[PDB]
């Protein structure tokens, strides 16, 4: 009982400490910045190869090829410029909820409700692709997968845990456990030295791949959060939740910085992504469309309404030339 | 009580973080956004000559 | 991977013969196939090509109407039917593997080859030289010229470099004039512009002597080069 | 005079209503639905033929009013061909839809394999070819006649005029009013008999109301087809069997019978598409 | 234009044809979801038919292909992955009929049934309900009255009407009686005739779906 009171006192002390250094009034700091006006985006291409709802999509460092996964037990690599399909990998367990594309371009990792992470070898002799390694050890369901190197992969599973693996041996190198609920998202920093994860506790934690110990804990959401994306500078990130609000946190200030909400938006968000310059914020709602938020003024810029169902994924090219949105409509479009 | 002790240890470890005033932290974001406005095809539309789509 | 050719021998003029290409160790049904023949003391020439699924077939001008090509995907075997053999068909035939997609490396493997003897608008590619004396440890340069600009509107220049060691089948070195094939040491390099190409070898050691061929892939038919020979 | 003016007005009204309805249905199908299922393909095909046949009416109207045929020979040929062609395409499409519904309701396990969009396209192409198999002889055979002071479109037969004319009339009567009626009535009767014992459509008030609406729609479709095709066939049979001397009543009766066939064409879409559940869902 | 991209286009067309064929083959079949309480009757149901996270069971009966997903081996928030099963043909629910006195189990089973039936995604799919351990229920009623778990129950302790009362109590839990149907059956270890019941339910569901897609419904 006394120990719980001590923990509560520590929490109150932390809250007071972060409140003492909180003279932000940021809307009074950037109120003189000219608006970005109105942003008009028109669809440029449509990839029609899937026969079911798609749940994942990841661009490549080439910024030309991308991968997408759906529930028909197939993930196919697209050629965005020409709309041709490069590969069509038949996967064993049709229940897949995430996918990843290696930065070098040699590997593709997919995993879902089957509690196993599968890594496929793209560039190899004998022609077709092959399953390089199957990763086992989790007890929930894989929510997100990101690549650090060609030998290291970080996974986010449904059993309130995150892990770091090595492909050559298939063993859990490091395990992160500080959450009290299912973790749904994950995003690596540009320098690949640390990452943040968001769980069903309406709290986001900041880990680091070196020691495996949590650094800071962020909170302020009223419901489950589903999307996380780092700022291009690497000192901030934005989160989306079922609360129908998007908010931006700061690592150095260690507290909330913005809230993005509107009166006529009462539905949650499944995807959040930033622009190359960081001045625009892309959020994918379940209202069958995604909006563009001016990240420095919390003012809406444009609306991208071209889908007949909720969007389950969203990504921006590495050079920031185009944005691709996928939905349960089974068609994913490219906007520019 | 084993989990609670670990929770208190984690909170104590997290409590020792040096903060900065937000006005200094909020200026960094604006400075980064203002200095990279030209290298943003989405914010500034590009001519169709250089547009691959 | 493993390719074996069989069906050679001596054929009287005006007869017929069948050549069988046996493919093993790789997914045959996903690869296109080519037939390339080499004269007894001359360079390589292109004969025929089959797409994936037998959906597209091309023939050379000099063999159109006399040669028939086909594949058997269930049995993993490639067939070439030859009719009305002449005295100019005496050569050695190679089975070539190829695959086309964004980022692929076609012409990456060549078969051993079978010997066959008979009793008695195109783009031309020119080799600057024909034979150069080479000393080990030095650097040499090989030039290649084309009658047409190989640069395309999509930003790709189609150029392939091949090296043939004595008593061995040629192997791919560089594709699209700038990329190095798998297993090739980084000593070789490629550069150049439209209708002007150059191959660079640095600190070359032994076992690098042979004939270097210059090949284009902008349009059919595919035309090889005369061949530059390197001698110690 | 008055009778000719009334006939012309009725013909023009029928043609205008049919063309407007068919074009509206075609636009709605093409723009919005974009061929979702095989039913959409069937309705699209039916809406095409109906209008390609009704577009023909103003030529007959001007032929009747003017009293002569000034269009020529090739255009008269094409008019007669597209008049004997769509009259078969529409009936074949209706029979195909009835058979599709019967095989979908009574045999679901086999309908899992048979009912595919590719099969719908193949069946549509086969129906068009089968209709062309009889449309083309009319194209090659129909001619124009230069009478004493008038020009009319008539078919000149290759010597046995009575024999071959009666053969054609009997063939069209058998293959356009007996077999289609029999097949559609058997299919719909079997479908209703099997559907009357489905647990999902019996046990409460709403389920019984749904079953009643389904059987009412089936009955009204069959009744419209029967009522709108019987008079013209029976009138043709009587005319070909009895001398029936010319009278001002005979021309009016024949024109009214032809109007009834065009009325059948206009009535058929307003039941199949304007009341389609998919169309209602799209409208709402 | 299209120097060698023609081969890439041909490869894309071929793999698209393969995708179309695979999609048609996958759409030919029907999928079944098996829910239920913890180790109530789900074990013996799978054993009656021919037959990590989840396990998929393949079996065929009278020229029809069935796929059964046993998702009970996953411990996580159900609301975060239950939307992946939208469009399933039918849901199989297993309830232990002889566990009416051991523990409260019947009340939590009814709560789970209420949660599953009135879900936002399953507002249209039909439910097949199986009551296992019928034989074991016969010997546990004459000694232990059914009133233990049903205080409002007032009737004779006979199996014939107690089973009907339990069936009605389970069946009247759906708030949408004009859109979805519930098929109830009594199953024991022997008498392997449940596959015919599943076939009949799936046939009715397929007939309803065909009517809905054919414009009549
Ligand atoms: C028994 C059928 C018959 O008797 N049918 C065909 C027919 C009747 C009613 C409706 C439709 C289309 O739903 C087709 C005849 C009726 C008289 N039309 C005259 C056409 C015509 C007139 C003047 C000049 C040229 C051609 C020819 C076909």
Structure tokens at A206: 């900041």
Taking the C-alpha atoms of residue A137 and residue D123, their distance in angstroms, rounded to an integer, is 54
Looking at chain A, which subunits does it touch, using at least 3 CB pairs closer than 8 Å as the criterion?
B, C, E
C208 and C132 fall within a common domain: yes
Strands (DSSP E) contained in E19-151 are 30-36, 55-60, 65-70, 90-96, 126-132
Q: Which residues of E touch A116 (CB under 8 A)?
A: 52-53
- CB of E206 within 8 Å of a chain D CB? The answer is yes
- Burial of residue A208 (CB within 10 Å: 0-12, 13-18, 19+) is middle
Taking the C-alpha atoms of residue C156 and residue B21, their distance in angstroms, rounded to an integer, is 53
Q: How far is D220 from chain E (nearest CA, A)?
A: 14
Q: Quick check: A158 and A182 in contact, CB under 8 A?
A: yes
Query: What is residue C79's three-state secondary structure?
Result: strand
Q: Cα dihedral sign for E204, E206, E207, E211?
A: positive
Tokens 């095909």 belong to which residue?
D45
A290 Cα distance to chain centroid: 15
Structure tokens at B21: 């005033």
Structure tokens at A69: 């996964």
For residue C32, the surrounding DSSP H or E stretch is: strand C32-38
Of B4, B20, B36, the CB nearest to A277: B36
Method underlying the structure: cryo-EM
How far is CA A99 from each of CA A85, A91, D209, rounded to the nearest angstrom? 17, 12, 49
Q: Cα dihedral sign for D197, D198, D199, D204?
A: negative
Q: Quick check: D233 and D173 in contact, CB under 8 A?
A: yes
Structure tokens at A262: 């509107």
Q: Which residues of A touch E8 (CB under 8 A)?
A: 79, 82, 84
Taking the C-alpha atoms of residue E212 and residue E214, their distance in angstroms, rounded to an integer, is 6
> Among A334, A235, A230, which residue's Cα sits nearest to residue A272?
A230
> Among C125, C159, C129, which residue's Cα sits nearest to residue C230?
C129
Of E3, E6, E8, the CB nearest to C152: E3
Tokens 């849901």 belong to which residue?
E91
Query: What is residue E182's three-state secondary structure?
Result: strand
- CB of A90 within 8 Å of a chain E CB? The answer is yes
Q: Quick check: E124 and E180 in contact, CB under 8 A?
A: yes
Other CB atoms within a 10 A radius of the CB of residue D284 amount to 5
For residue A314, the surrounding DSSP H or E stretch is: strand A311-316
Structure tokens at C141: 């340069």
Q: Quick check: E109 and E72 in contact, CB under 8 A?
A: no
Residues A127, C30: C-beta atoms closer than 8 Å: yes
First to last CA, chain C: 32
First to last CA, chain B: 60
Structure tokens at A192: 């690949």
Measuring from atom 18 of ligand 1, which residue has the nearest CA?
D83
C111 and C167 fall within a common domain: no
Other CB atoms within a 10 A radius of the CB of residue C27 amount to 13
Q: How far is C141 from chain E (nearest CA, A)?
A: 29
Task: Indicate whether residue D154 lines ligand 1 (CB < 6 A).
Answer: no
Taking the C-alpha atoms of residue C227 and residue C212, their distance in angstroms, rounded to an integer, is 5
Q: Quick check: C67 and C49 in contact, CB under 8 A?
A: no
Q: What share of chain B is helix, strand, coil (3-state, %, to 5)?
A: 55, 0, 45
Q: What is the dihedral of CA D104, D110, D113, D116, to 10 degrees?
A: -20
DSSP 8-class letter at C210: S
Which one of D118, D199, D204, D280 makes the best mutation probe of the E interface by having the most chain E beta carbons within 10 Å?
A: D199
Structure tokens at E192: 């392997």
Say which CATH number the domain at D160 has. 1.20.1070.10
Domain span at D213:
1-281
Instruction: Give me the number of domains chain A comprises.
Output: 1
Where do the H-state alpha helices sit in C80-176?
A: none
Residues B33, A323: C-beta atoms closer than 8 Å: no
Cβ density class E125-162: b for 16+ within 10 Å, e for less? bbbbbbbbbbeebeebbeeeebeebbeeeeeeeeeeeb
Q: Quick check: A75 and A57 in contact, CB under 8 A?
A: no
Residues E81, A200: C-beta atoms closer than 8 Å: no
Instruction: Give me the number of domains chain D comprises.
Output: 1
Query: What is residue A45's three-state secondary structure?
Result: strand
First to last CA, chain A: 58
For residue C92, the surrounding DSSP H or E stretch is: strand C91-98
Distance (angstroms) between ligand 1 centre and the Cα of D14 equals 15
- Burial of residue E176 (CB within 10 Å: 0-12, 13-18, 19+) is exposed
C82 and C132 fall within a common domain: no
For residue B4, the surrounding DSSP H or E stretch is: helix B2-15
Where is the domain boundary, C118, C147, C182? C118
Structure tokens at A313: 């994924």
- Burial of residue C40 (CB within 10 Å: 0-12, 13-18, 19+) is exposed
Where do the H-state alpha helices sit in chain D?
A: 2-28, 38-54, 57-66, 74-106, 108-114, 117-141, 161-173, 179-195, 205-241, 248-272, 277-283
DSSP 8-class letter at A74: E
The CATH code of domain B1-53 reads 4.10.260.10
Say which CATH number the domain at C176 has. 2.60.40.10
Measuring from atom 7 of ligand 1, which residue has the nearest CA?
D87
Phi, psi of E130 (to 5 degrees): -120, 135
Residues A3, B20: C-beta atoms closer than 8 Å: no
Q: CATH number for the E1-217 domain, one of 3.90.950.20, 3.30.70.20, 3.30.300.30, 3.40.50.300? A: 3.40.50.300
Taking the C-alpha atoms of residue B50 and residue A112, their distance in angstroms, rounded to an integer, is 39
Residues A113, E9: C-beta atoms closer than 8 Å: no
Of E15, E22, E84, the CB nearest to A85: E15
Taking the C-alpha atoms of residue C114 and residue C169, their distance in angstroms, rounded to an integer, is 11
How far is CA E208 from each of CA A289, E180, E211, E213, E214, rounded to the nearest angstrom? 32, 11, 5, 9, 10
Taking the C-alpha atoms of residue A196 and residue A239, their distance in angstroms, rounded to an integer, is 11
Where is the domain boundary, C118, C144, C165? C118
Nearest residue in A to B53, CA atom = A44
Q: How far is C100 from chain E (nearest CA, A)?
A: 6
For residue E16, the surrounding DSSP H or E stretch is: helix E5-28
Q: Quick check: E208 and E194 in contact, CB under 8 A?
A: no
Taking the C-alpha atoms of residue C157 and residue C177, their distance in angstroms, rounded to an integer, is 7
Phi, psi of A218 (to 5 degrees): -110, 145
- CB of E90 within 8 Å of a chain D CB? The answer is no
Residues E7, C102: C-beta atoms closer than 8 Å: no
For residue A195, the surrounding DSSP H or E stretch is: strand A194-199
Helices (H) and strands (E) in chain E, counts: 6, 6
Residues A235, B20: C-beta atoms closer than 8 Å: no
Where is the domain boundary, C95, C118, C141? C118
Q: Which residues of E touch D199 (CB under 8 A)?
A: 181, 204
C107 and C201 fall within a common domain: no
Declared resolution, Å = 3.3
Cβ density class C167-185: b for 16+ within 10 Å, e for less? eebbbbbbbbbeebbeeee
What is the CB-side half-sphere exposure of residue A262 using CA atoms within 13 A?
14
Give the residue extent of every domain in chain E. Answer: 1-217
Looking at chain D, which subunits does it touch, using at least 3 CB pairs closer than 8 Å as the criterion?
E
Bridge partners (DSSP) listed for residue D151: D146
- CB of A88 within 8 Å of a chain B CB? The answer is no
Please confirm whether the linkage preceding C221 is cis (ω < 30° from 0).
Answer: yes
Q: How far is A18 from chain E (nearest CA, A)?
A: 33
- CB of B52 within 8 Å of a chain A CB? The answer is yes
Q: Which residues of E touch D281 (CB under 8 A)?
A: none
Q: Quick check: A308 and A263 in contact, CB under 8 A?
A: no
Domain span at C193:
125-230
Residues A126, C101: C-beta atoms closer than 8 Å: no
Bridge partners (DSSP) listed for residue E94: E36, E130
Rounded to the nearest 10 degrees, the angle between the axes of helix D117-141 and helix D38-54 is 20
C28 and C102 fall within a common domain: yes
Of A65, A84, A127, the CB nearest to C31: A127
């Amino acid at each position: 009982d006394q120990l719980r009171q001590e923990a509560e006192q520590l929490k109150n002390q932390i809250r007071d400490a972060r409140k003492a250094c909180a003279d932000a009034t940021l809307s009074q700091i950037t109120n003189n910045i000219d608006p970005v006006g109105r942003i008009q985006m028109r669809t440029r291409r449509t990839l029609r190869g899937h026969l079911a709802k798609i749940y994942a999509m990841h661009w490549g460092t080439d910024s030309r090829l991308l991968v997408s996964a759906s529930q028909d037990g197939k993930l196919i690599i697209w050629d965005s410029y020409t709309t041709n399909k490069v590969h069509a990998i038949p996967l064993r367990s049709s229940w897949v909820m995430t996918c990843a594309y290696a930065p070098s371009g040699n590997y593709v990792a997919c995993g879902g409700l089957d509690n196993i992470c599968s890594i496929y070898n793209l560039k190899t002799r004998e022609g077709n692709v092959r399953v390089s390694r199957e990763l086992a050890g989790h007890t929930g369901y894989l929510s997100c997968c990101r690549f650090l190197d060609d030998n290291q992969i970080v996974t986010s599973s449904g059993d309130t845990t995150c892990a770091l693996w090595d492909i050559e041996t298939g063993q859990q190198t490091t395990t992160f456990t500080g959450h009290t609920g299912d973790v749904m998202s994950l995003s690596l920093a540009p320098d690949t030295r640390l990452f943040v994860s968001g769980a069903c506790d309406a709290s986001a934690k900041l880990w680091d791949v070196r020691e495996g110990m949590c650094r800071q804990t962020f909170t302020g959401h009223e419901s489950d959060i589903n999307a996380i994306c780092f700022f291009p500078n690497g000192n901030a990130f934005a989160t989306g939740s079922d609360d129908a609000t998007c908010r931006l946190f700061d690592l150095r200030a260690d507290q909330e910085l913005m809230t993005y909400s509107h009166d006529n938006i009462i539905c949650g968000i499944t995807s959040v992504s930033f622009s190359k310059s960081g001045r625009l914020l892309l959020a994918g709602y379940d209202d069958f469309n995604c909006n563009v938020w001016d990240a420095l003024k919390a003012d809406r810029a444009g609306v991208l309404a071209g889908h007949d169902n909720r969007v389950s994924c969203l990504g921006v090219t590495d050079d920031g030339m185009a944005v691709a949105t996928g939905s349960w409509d089974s068609f994913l479009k490219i906007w520019n | 009580i084993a989990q609670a002790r670990k929770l208190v240890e984690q909170l104590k470890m997290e409590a020792n973080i040096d903060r900065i005033k937000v006005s200094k932290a909020a200026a960094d974001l604006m400075a980064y956004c203002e200095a990279h406005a030209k290298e943003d095809p989405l914010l500034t539309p590009v001519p169709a000559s250089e547009n691959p789509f | 991977v493993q390719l074996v050719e069989s069906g050679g021998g001596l054929v009287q003029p005006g007869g017929s013969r069948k050549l069988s290409c046996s493919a093993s160790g790789f997914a045959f049904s996903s690869f296109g196939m080519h037939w390339v023949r080499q004269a007894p003391e001359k360079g390589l020439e292109w004969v025929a090509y089959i797409s994936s699924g037998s959906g597209t077939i091309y023939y050379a001008d000099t063999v159109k109407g006399r040669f028939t090509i086909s594949r058997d995907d269930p049995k993993n075997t490639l067939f070439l039917q030859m009719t009305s053999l002449r005295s100019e068909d005496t050569a050695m035939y190679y089975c070539v593997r190829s695959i086309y997609y964004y980022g692929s490396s076609p012409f990456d493997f060549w078969g051993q080859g079978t010997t066959l003897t008979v009793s008695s608008s195109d783009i031309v590619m020119t080799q600057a030289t024909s034979s150069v004396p080479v000393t080990p440890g030095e650097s040499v340069s090989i030039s290649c010229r084309s009658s047409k600009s190989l640069l395309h509107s999509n930003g790709n220049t189609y150029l392939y470099w091949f090296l043939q060691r004595p008593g061995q089948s040629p192997q791919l070195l560089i594709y699209r004039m700038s990329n190095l094939a798998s297993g090739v040491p980084d000593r070789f390099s490629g550069s150049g512009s439209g209708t002007a190409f150059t191959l660079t070898i640095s600190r070359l050691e032994a076992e690098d002597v042979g004939v270097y061929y210059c090949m284009q892939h902008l349009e059919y038919p595919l035309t090889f080069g005369a061949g530059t020979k390197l001698e110690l | 005079m008055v009778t000719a003016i009334t006939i012309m007005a009725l013909y023009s009204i029928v043609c205008v209503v049919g063309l407007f309805g068919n074009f509206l249905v075609m636009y709605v199908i093409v723009r919005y639905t974009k061929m979702k299922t095989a039913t959409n393909i069937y309705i699209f095909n039916l809406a095409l033929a109906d209008a390609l046949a009704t577009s023909t009416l103003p030529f007959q109207s001007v032929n009747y009013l003017m009293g002569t045929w000034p269009f020529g020979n090739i255009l008269c040929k094409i008019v007669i061909s597209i008049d004997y062609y769509n009259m078969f395409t529409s009936i074949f499409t209706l029979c195909t839809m009835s058979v599709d519904r019967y095989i979908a309701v009574c045999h679901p396990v086999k309908a899992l394999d048979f009912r595919t969009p590719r099969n719908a396209k193949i069946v549509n192409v086969c129906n068009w070819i089968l209709s062309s198999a009889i449309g083309l002889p009319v194209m090659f055979m129909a001619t124009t006649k230069y009478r004493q002071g008038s020009i009319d479109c008539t078919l000149t037969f290759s010597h046995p005029t009575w024999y071959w004319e009666n053969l054609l009339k009997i063939c069209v009567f058998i293959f356009a009013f007996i077999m289609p009626v029999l097949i559609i009535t058997v299919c719909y009767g079997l479908m209703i008999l099997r559907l009357k014992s489905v647990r999902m459509l019996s046990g409460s008030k709403e389920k019984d109301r749904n079953l009643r609406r389904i059987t009412r729609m089936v009955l009204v479709v069959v009744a419209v087809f029967i009522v709108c095709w019987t008079p013209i066939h029976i009138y043709v049979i009587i005319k070909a069997l009895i001398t029936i001397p010319e009278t001002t009543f005979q021309t009016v009766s024949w024109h009214f019978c032809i109007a009834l066939g065009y009325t059948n064409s206009c009535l058929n879409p307003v039941l199949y598409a304007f009341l389609d559940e998919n169309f209602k869902r799209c409208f709402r | 234009l299209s120097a060698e991209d023609k081969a890439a286009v041909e490869r894309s067309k071929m793999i698209d044809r393969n995708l179309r064929e695979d999609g048609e083959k996958a759409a030919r079949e029907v999928k079944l979801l098996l829910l239920g309480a913890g180790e109530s009757g789900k074990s013996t149901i799978v054993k009656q038919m021919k037959i990590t996270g989840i396990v998929e069971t393949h079996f065929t009966f009278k020229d029809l292909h069935f796929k059964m997903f046993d998702v009970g081996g996953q411990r996580s928030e159900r609301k975060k992955w239950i939307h992946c099963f939208e469009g399933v043909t039918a849901i199989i629910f297993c309830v232990a009929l002889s566990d009416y006195d051991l523990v409260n189990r019947m009340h939590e089973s009814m709560k789970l049934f209420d949660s599953i039936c009135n879900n936002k995604w399953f507002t249209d799919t039909s439910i097949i309900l199986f009551l296992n351990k019928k034989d074991l229920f016969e010997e546990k009623i004459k000694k232990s009255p059914l009133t233990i778990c049903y205080p409002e129950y007032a009737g004779s302790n006979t199996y014939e009407e107690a089973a009907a009362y339990i069936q009605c109590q389970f069946e009247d839990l759906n708030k949408r009686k004009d859109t979805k149907e519930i098929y109830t059956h009594f199953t024991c270890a022997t008498d392997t005739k449940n596959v015919q019941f599943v076939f009949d339910a799936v046939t009715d569901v397929i007939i309803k779906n065909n009517l809905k897609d054919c414009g009549l419904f």
